[PDB]
Every structure is written in structure tokens, then in C-alpha cells.
């Protein structure tokens, strides 16, 4: 049997199968405080001398 000895539960470790390539979970750029989660960005300006 694929169940356990006295437990009535399956005992066969795991036999899974994912569907897609499955990444890019849309890592949100808003933490719990929701500011912007700033990283160093592009300034868009002229030559600052």
C-alpha cells in the first residue's frame, strides 16, 4: 500500500510536477511602510559641475 501502516495517510515522500518556468513573482517595491523602497536611481539632469 502507498498509505502508512496505522496512519491512514499517504507515505510516499513527494511526487510533484510544476507547470511553467515559474519565476518573476512580482517582487513588490513597497515595504510595509510603503515609501518607495528607494535604490540609487537615474537623476535625469545636465552636467553638474
Amino acid at each position: 500500500t502507498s498509505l502508512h501502516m496505522s496512519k491512514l495517510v499517504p507515505v510516499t515522500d513527494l511526487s510533484p510536477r510544476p507547470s511553467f518556468r515559474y519565476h518573476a513573482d512580482t517582487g513588490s517595491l513597497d515595504a510595509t511602510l510603503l515609501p518607495v523602497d528607494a535604490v540609487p536611481q537615474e537623476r535625469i539632469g545636465r552636467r553638474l559641475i
Binding site: 510544476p18 507547470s19 511553467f20 518556468r21 515559474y22 518573476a24 512580482t26
Partner: protein
């Protein structure tokens, strides 16, 4: 689980599908002998010791192209009865491929299609590729649809016509072959996309700056279009747009199911170094009239629904900004009963390129399927040409003496005339 069955009738279908499954093998990491060194289930079938077999029937009445596949490197990829052939060609006749010589092959085409479609329930539909201007692409291309409509009724039927050019023909009976088959795919095809050969000829000359592309180079762009069209089925994305979404958002009436195609960017390594492929400019190049893949000019036609297949690292807020720019543009025009006219879908896998082909590496792409009232001219150049064959019996005896009766030329002509009236009354 889910799968889609490819159909390829005619030698144009065989060698287009050769480039298509060359792109599908290279996308999923599948060697031509089958073994990969579960997103593949949409096209390939898992079998045995981890090998994969394509779900694509290969129909052609002459073995001059299909046993070349049987002796080429893609022979241990397909099953031998997955590639089927008779003895004798149709020789550019609708009446040959529909009344005389298509019987001994179609009875085993349905025998293979029953055991390719019973593999897993939840099948999406069929993707037939045909050469409408040819003999067995029109003839057996017609005859296979009454069999699929009466057997597999409710399932979706996609058709990709290799549309004859307005001036380039490479055949003189192709107005007979095209009229007799477009009459029948009008009510037997759910979604039909026109793919004119000159429309791909000038798009390689312009956007690739390649001056000698050929049939195989044409088949690479067609393969890139169909791969991006099914890329939602085979890969994850923000907005998944499967096969049923093509119907419900593009075709408004059961008769008006002819749609144009466009693919942008299609850029060689000379220019991909110099251009940045922003979402705004890949959809301006997708919407420009020179980028239509049907030689169907849309300045004098009215768009009503455009599907946008973004394929790559595309954030959807650039999509919503770009389609807004398309709305504000006045050179194009939309019909009065479609203020909403876009169905955008996002896929996250970038489109790969073949090593040694004519496409450079690309970060995002757009595959457009658009329904417009501009299709009246590509059926009116049809109307004027087929009338002047019909005036004094041009090549009629090669049809009437081979199964059909004289009079279906009139029945197919008046049905396409009703298609012209239908396109005229909708556009007003």
C-alpha cells in the same frame, strides 16, 4: 493536461511547420532526436525515457517534400505516421484535392487525428497552416475542415492562409484555387489570419535590410509569429491570453473572421546595436502601415480590435501608456462602435532566436492580430481577377472534368460578393 494540435497541409505548410517546430524545439531545449538533456505539454508529448514527440500532422499529396523531412535530421523527432502522404500531387487544382485524389489520404489523416487528440482532455484547438493559392492547400485544405467541423465541432479552428500576392502569382489558376477555398473557410474556420508572401518579402527587405531572403526565411518570421501567439500557453505572464481569448476579443461576427498580422521588432544585428526597443516604439512600428503582413493597407481601413502580444521584460504600465498614444494618433482610425479596441497580453519569456538565422537577439516583441475593414481591397483585387477568368472559360475543364460540376464557380463568387457587402455595411 492542455495541448494544441498543429496541422500543416501543402508543401508550404510542411516547410513553414519545419521552421515552426525548429523554433519550438529550440525554445524548450529539445534535441532533434527527442531527449531533453512541464511547459512543453502545449506542443510536445512526454513519452518513454524522457523524450518528447511533436503533435503535428503533416499532410501533403506529393512526397517530394515530406520524405525530405523523413531523410533530414528531424526524422527521429516525429513519428513516421505523424507525417503522411499519398502518391500524386493536386497540380494546382481545387477539384483535384477535393473531388478526385484526396480520399485515400484523408481517411488516415482523421485516423491519426483521433489518436493525437485523445491523448489528454482539455485540448485547446487546431492550428492549420495552408497555402490557399495552391492545389492541395486549397483542395485538401478545404476537405479537412468539413471533417473537423462534423467530428470535432465545438473546438477552435485556427487557419493561417498563405495569401497570394496582388501581382506576384507563381500560378495562373490560383484565382480558381483561392476562390473555391475562401468560400469554404468562411464558415468552417473560427479564426483566420492572412499572410501574404510579398508582405513578408518587403518586410525583410526593409526591417532586416536583407536583400536575398527566400521561402525558408519567410517561414522563420511566420514561426516567430505563431510562437509568440502561443507563448501565453507555454509561459507565464501578467495577463494570460489563451486561444479562447483570441476569439472573444477580435472576431465580432461569425463571418468577419479574417485578420491581419504584424510582428515588430524584426531587426538584424546591424541595427539592434543602435536602437533601444522601448514599448512605445515597438508598437508604433507594429502599427505602421508598412509592417502589415497581408499587403492590406489600413489607412483607408477602419480598425476595430487589435490583439497585442508583448513577449519579454515588459512592464504593463508601458503597455497602457503606449496604447494610449495609439489612441491619440489620428493617422489611424477606429470604428464608432469600438471606443475600446485593444486586447493586450503580457508574456514573460523573451523570444529566442535561432543560431545563424536572420533575427538578432531581442529583449521584447509584439505580435499583433488586428481585425479591420481594410480587407475589402484584398478581396476586390480577387473579385476583378476571377471575373476575367470566368468571362470565356479559362482553365475550366481542369476542374469540371475532375469531379465537380460547372456552377460552383458562380456559387463561390457570389458568396465572396456577399462577403464584400458584409464588410461594406459594417464599416459605415
Amino acid at each position: 493536461m492542455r495541448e494544441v494540435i498543429s496541422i500543416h497541409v501543402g508543401q508550404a505548410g510542411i516547410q513553414i511547420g519545419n521552421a515552426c517546430w525548429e523554433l519550438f524545439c529550440l525554445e524548450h531545449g529539445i534535441q532533434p532526436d527527442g531527449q531533453m538533456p512541464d511547459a512543453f505539454n502545449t506542443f510536445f508529448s512526454e513519452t518513454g525515457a524522457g523524450k518528447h514527440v511533436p503533435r503535428c500532422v503533416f499532410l501533403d499529396l506529393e512526397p517530394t517534400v515530406v520524405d525530405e523531412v523523413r531523410t533530414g535530421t528531424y526524422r527521429h523527432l516525429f513519428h513516421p505516421e505523424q507525417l503522411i502522404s499519398g502518391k500524386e500531387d493536386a497540380a494546382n487544382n481545387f477539384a483535384r484535392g477535393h473531388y478526385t485524389i484526396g480520399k485515400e489520404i484523408v481517411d488516415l489523416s482523421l485516423d491519426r487525428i483521433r489518436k493525437l487528440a485523445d491523448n489528454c482532455t482539455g485540448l485547446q484547438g487546431f492550428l492549420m497552416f495552408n497555402a490557399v493559392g495552391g492545389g492541395t492547400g486549397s483542395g485538401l485544405g478545404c476537405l479537412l475542415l468539413e471533417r473537423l467541423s462534423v467530428d470535432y465541432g465545438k473546438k477552435s479552428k485556427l487557419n493561417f492562409c498563405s495569401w497570394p500576392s496582388p501581382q506576384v502569382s507563381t500560378a495562373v489558376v490560383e484565382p480558381y484555387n483561392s476562390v473555391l477555398s475562401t468560400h469554404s473557410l468562411l464558415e468552417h474556420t473560427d479564426v483566420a489570419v492572412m499572410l501574404d508572401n510579398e508582405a513578408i518579402y518587403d518586410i525583410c527587405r526593409r526591417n532586416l535590410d536583407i536583400e536575398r531572403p527566400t521561402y525558408t526565411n519567410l517561414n522563420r518570421l511566420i514561426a516567430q509569429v505563431i510562437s509568440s501567439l502561443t507563448a501565453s500557453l507555454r509561459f507565464d505572464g501578467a495577463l494570460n491570453v489563451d486561444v479562447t481569448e483570441f476569439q472573444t476579443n477580435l472576431v465580432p461576427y461569425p463571418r468577419i473572421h479574417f485578420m491581419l498580422s504584424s510582428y515588430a521588432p524584426i531587426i538584424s544585428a546591424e541595427k539592434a546595436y543602435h536602437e533601444q526597443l522601448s514599448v512605445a516604439e515597438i508598437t508604433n512600428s507594429a502599427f505602421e502601415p508598412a509592417s502589415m503582413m497581408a499587403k492590406c493597407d489600413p489607412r483607408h481601413g477602419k480598425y476595430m480590435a487589435c490583439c497585442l502580444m508583448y513577449r519579454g521584460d515588459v512592464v504593463p504600465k508601458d503597455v497602457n501608456a503606449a496604447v494610449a498614444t495609439i489612441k491619440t494618433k489620428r493617422t489611424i482610425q477606429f470604428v464608432d462602435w469600438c471606443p475600446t479596441g485593444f486586447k493586450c497580453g503580457i508574456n514573460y519569456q523573451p523570444p529566442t532566436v535561432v543560431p545563424g538565422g536572420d533575427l538578432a537577439k531581442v529583449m521584447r516583441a509584439v505580435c499583433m492580430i488586428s481585425n479591420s475593414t481594410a480587407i475589402a481591397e484584398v478581396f476586390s483585387r480577387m473579385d476583378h481577377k476571377f471575373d476575367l477568368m470566368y468571362a470565356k472559360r479559362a482553365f475550366v475543364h481542369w476542374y469540371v472534368g475532375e469531379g465537380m460540376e460547372e456552377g460552383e464557380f458562380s456559387e463561390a463568387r457570389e458568396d465572396l460578393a456577399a462577403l464584400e457587402k458584409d464588410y461594406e455595411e459594417v464599416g459605415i
